[model samples]
Target: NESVLKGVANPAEQVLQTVDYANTRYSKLDQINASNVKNLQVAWTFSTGVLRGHEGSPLVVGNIMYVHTPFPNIVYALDLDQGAKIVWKYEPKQDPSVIPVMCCDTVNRGLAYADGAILLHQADTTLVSLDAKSGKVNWSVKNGDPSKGETNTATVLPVKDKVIVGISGGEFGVQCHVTAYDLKSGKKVWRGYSIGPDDQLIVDPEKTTSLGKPIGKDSSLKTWEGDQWKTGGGCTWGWFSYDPKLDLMYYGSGNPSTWNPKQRPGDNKWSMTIWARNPDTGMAKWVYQMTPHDEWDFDGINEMILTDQKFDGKDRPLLTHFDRNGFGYTLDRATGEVLVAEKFDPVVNWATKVDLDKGSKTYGRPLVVSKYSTEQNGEDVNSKGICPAALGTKDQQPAAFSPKTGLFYVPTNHVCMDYEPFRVTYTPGQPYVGATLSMYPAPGSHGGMGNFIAWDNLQGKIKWSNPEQFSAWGGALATAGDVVFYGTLEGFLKAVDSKTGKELYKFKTPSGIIGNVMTYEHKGKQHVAVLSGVGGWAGIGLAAGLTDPNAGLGAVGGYAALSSYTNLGGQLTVFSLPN
Candidate 1:
């Protein structure tokens, strides 16, 4: 009753599987409270030694801990019953040739846990089913062709009997789709394309609604012109959550391909939007675009956290999302109506605000967002300052919703960007991005690049925020013990009080963390784990060891100087109350 399937706990003793479908990332255990959290210390550490970008916490099932590394993706199993001893190590021959194709840092989101297998969505475009007892592969299916600009590195979700996987290649101009495969067997079941025809979008026009009204006919197909949408960028490379009660799954789409908004216009149907679909049939139910015709590289592909909260003075199931466009929206999960919308970050100028007119029903997206939209500026002609850098106010580092504290603890970036769009021709298996911009702290922000904040999603307000010198890139963990955990741009893992933003404990990990923080109960003890390796956009230079410093980063954004910070780290740190 606290929060649905709260943890990846075994249904028997509470096993850890897919970190619990709710994606709330909050635990019900209260043994480790705020008062005793400061007494926590490192109990064990395992080194992957691969050392690149570590972006996910270890997936612990029963007494086994599964750890996944970056490109040329490898898997390691640790026996939690023992002194955290190694059980088995499995390394697949993931081709190194695909390394250059990844748009962001070469990081694998994490592994997904199924019934009897650990699902591996490899960075090299391979999806494998591994025996949960042993690290041996039971079956392997090639999902994407890295040669075709498709990389299978997104964090997958195992729902029902189908294991859902998302693809990432918006930078490579690869048209993206969400493919569901048979969980027991690595077989492709059904596919849903982000853009294109009505059938592909699964949009039964009469049944789908944009706001409160219906989306006439051919809504997705007509929104696109010509064949431009063929390579239209609408990648599904973020966290996905499902509501078993409503039988609906929720996720956000990335930005439209070719950053130049002058190209395929007209809402760009689906991209930069939160989509609701039947997890079984992939039928489009409802969608609300956060940024129509996404001008900046503001990918809406962040996580859509599902929880039951008080909304509009009544308790209802609500969906809260902190979009890359700088808006924190709380929407009705069953109806996809924007219940509350507010700026999670302080310096947003793209649209003055998301004005939700509840009385008179608004027809489409900009109908709600357009009234305050500022995307009509000198795009393709001049430059503009957008509140969130393309890295997003909050990227893939998912936020956590704690019913105990009635707040969502979020890991976010405080930097904004001066975006300048450029014209570019799309090339196959190559970069199709057409924009250049400089990222810096917002004008009134005083060079603060990161902040960890507690968000009141229902009322759309920030209760408190702890500013970080560099952006906080790790996922947040909230608990019943009234403790919130997160990592820093540097290697420090900090724990703060859930009710108030008071720093209680801080432990320096091996490297900066770009992973989600996970908690599990092993035997009779509760343990917290995080993957650390300073890579990604912030630690790209250190991970890849670039000679030209800024090289591909350009002489813009604050990350252009990331080489000056942390280096490659491939250590998994586990903590618990000191005996």
Candidate 2:
């Protein structure tokens, strides 16, 4: 209850420091033991008017709890002592025109509570910091321009005296960077580009290497043939984790602007990669690219969980990543060196293995998803049946790790895609995407498009998995109570035994949940909180206000027709041990 946002949010402890920064959504709170989890009951429910796409989690500060909604983003402050009563609601007036331009559904990861303020990234490209008590605006900054194809859609990361924000629009052809704003005045401090010259990228090529070797003399530029790096599309659109002891912040970057790799030759150095940079001065330390040249639309924008692990008989700071490229990577957080890279998903046929020394992935079958394969065959052929669809093995949904179970719980997608690439022209505020994909359940996967699984990052293997017909959007949460929590597209909130991956309890909620979950203390009791709403890329067709029950994502008309039956609503559901 006291340290819920404790120790900057570490999953290794009994507290949750941040949404997913502890990056392992696992908690160590054991008050509500797994033995008694079945007795858990609904504590309360609060509706957010922004019904379609709600992707942010609730933030609890002492006696107050905060929940944020999508689009015309509103912040609700609930009094935790009195069964979640509303104290105040802050609404930001943003331009409606920005909605049609941004690539994904209007989503905000969650809030950053620091200095008694709740930070919210608005849909209209503005970052607003609201006073935690009264829900008043402390400061606001227009961090991005929607006209420039940039949207402040990712979670606002708080580091020391600065809050880091990444802009979205690799799908819209904008050169993106990770920028930090002053926590006090909301002024822009330093900006680190995903792909740029040494200074703009803040890279010291000689000192920056992925696998204990220099990437190149002029890494960023030398990796690209021409000026492709200009619009190369290495946007920072995911979760970020910070290592306070090392004074560094880490975040993965998105795909190269267009899906067609033939459009740009050579490895897109920093794109489709994980970067460790100094938060205070914006200096690049080291980077490891998961998908070089990135033929598939596998975004590297996943969570990088940091912790200490015994590696080869020596304890070292490890960063465990579940990449969109269908691989689970455990790296030395200090040096950004790959300790192990293995497929977390069995259907990973795109790359046979990751070459540790070269810091690159070796080609396999999914390579056929590219136009490069068409060139090899000298025919106009669309690559079909690529495993781990463009939506990725795990999309933006955050996963969890339990210190008690020594396991990572991930919300995964089991879909495959058929890709057709064509030359594309980039236009401002327009999708620069070059591939059209129809994603479906992977072959022989028993008609399930998703699976909630337990992964052993240290061993690079899965322990157990539960078949999910629909993608579990909100993400996973692990507790010291030896319980795991996550939500599905059809609005069910569930809890499972952390050690055995067995469902302990489940209760259907009002709507689907894409927002990650959180837990905190109210009075002397422990409570769990999460948002439920039909939103995210999976609900793009729904968020756009399409009434057709058969509406799908992009051209993939069957994205999740089953979800069409669920009503659209954003409700915050809370659970606690029945008194």
Candidate 3:
């Protein structure tokens, strides 16, 4: 049987998604090498016309560039041949009431292209498929109830014959799920809840392994107290990757609801977990929980990057993840075995290190420090000096993996927080977050809020780190040109040497950038593009125009100086070499 894993022969010609099925964000094109990257100039620009957090990048398929925006979730098809003219525009008539329910900011991660269709998972929990050429709706389906605080912020993953999407609402104490739909008909195929009954999780007790052991009976139910798992928050509003050979899809679950760690106790099974499940059947093959009984609000919903590397003198398929808990995990993709678990950020102090000795009492568990443990401090007592604030060492901003250098260029937040949890009762469609946090740059360090670091996933070490004044809130792009590209919250799109981490070129956009960086080839020229509209959890202070330090859930305190750097913008800045 031939391997169906590889999607595009040359990803530089046309982008499949924000990243390929491999989730590497590496391009095969070398036209814009490091030597001439300094000559890169602005090619063109297109405005989305809406200003909010622009999280993902535009997709270039042949002659058309598919662009997406936040909130109303507009999808525009621009003509590349005619100075970037609009071919078609898709704006869904969604109720503005769903805006408040969207946690963090009203950001929509880009769209998915599959067999002449563009899939948009909107902010109001509606999944719509549009004709790629006409911008007319092919089909629309309501995936969740926004009134119940269920929303969608993730980009859809198109598998063989299906498109899978995840939910967002971990802050509202909603039962989250990842659902699959038929590509042609838009019919629901399977729905798997993050935490619940073994059947609802779609896991076979005898077959599925949790932490390398057979998770027998009501695995998730038994882990929680009473029906707490019903409102358990394991939202999946992050990136997804599929391994064609194994036919398994990978994604991490969000933090358990109610950040107050003492409320819903007992490890909160599967909430902060890395799952490998069959995309066709929705049956979990293996699961590994990174943050058990998550006391730090470290959601595991970051992207799972897949790479093949030699480990222990043998080549293995590995899934690498830079998690919110500050640990970079390299696991056996097929068996869910923990291989390498180390801190990606030097400031990470919540846990000492992960105990990886198999057959030991504390296998696969992070040893929590009493000083940083919020639960151990009891309610209302603030746990201070915790490295990697709630936004994580990195949030949804993805890293890039290069086969040339065997390194991952990661966008990171070098920040810490003081978290204080208070008791609260859960109410439907309301904020169940019972914790208050204040974030700032890591103390006693360089005093910068972010760093763009090149990570060696196999060795579990950082090769080189580039500091930034603001959190490097944008995704990264690695190319065969020996150049790495990423955006800054200060609105600068930068290109650096992938090998030495030397800055080669940079251009300031109209506003701060929180989007993924992407590249494509058009008319025999290689061009790079990124969306600039600063607003996420970190830039909430500037986006909402709040001045008080504790305003945007304490985001104002750390990033208050961001107002001096950049302002609101909603445009796609495309760059290329001057002809």
- The most accurate candidate by TM-score is 3
Rank the candidate models, highest TM-score first. 3, 1, 2
State the TM-score for model 3.
0.98
| Order of quality (lDDT) | 3, 1, 2
| Candidate models: Cα lDDT each | 0.77, 0.76, 0.88
Cα distance off (Å), candidate 3, residue 72: 0.5
- Name the candidate, 1 or 3, with the larger TM-score value: 3
Error of 2 at 502 (Å): 1.1
User: Tens-digit lDDT track for model 3 on 1-579?
Assistant: 011123256555444554678789888888999999999999988888998789899887778899999989999999888779999998889998887887788888898777888889999989998998999999999999999999888889888888889999999898888899988899999988889987779998998887779889887887799888888999998899888888899999998998888887898988999988899889899999999899977989998899988888899999999998999999999999989999889999999999998877999999999999999998999989889898899999998999989999989999999989999999998888888889989997899999999888777899899999889999999998999999999899999999999999999999898999888888888999999999988878777677887667667789988889888889999999986
For each of the candidates, give the backbone clash count: 11, 3, 0
- lDDT tens digits, residues 439-549, model 1? 676668657788899999877799999998888888898877899989886888999999887999899897888887777777778888888997776666566666552
Between candidates 2 and 3, which one is better according to lDDT? Answer: 3
For residues 272-335, write the lDDT of model 2, one tens digit per residue: 8889999888877888787877777789999888877777789888999988889888888888
Native-to-model Cα distance after best TM-score fit, residue 127 in candidate 3, in Å: 0.7
TM-score of each: 0.94, 0.93, 0.98
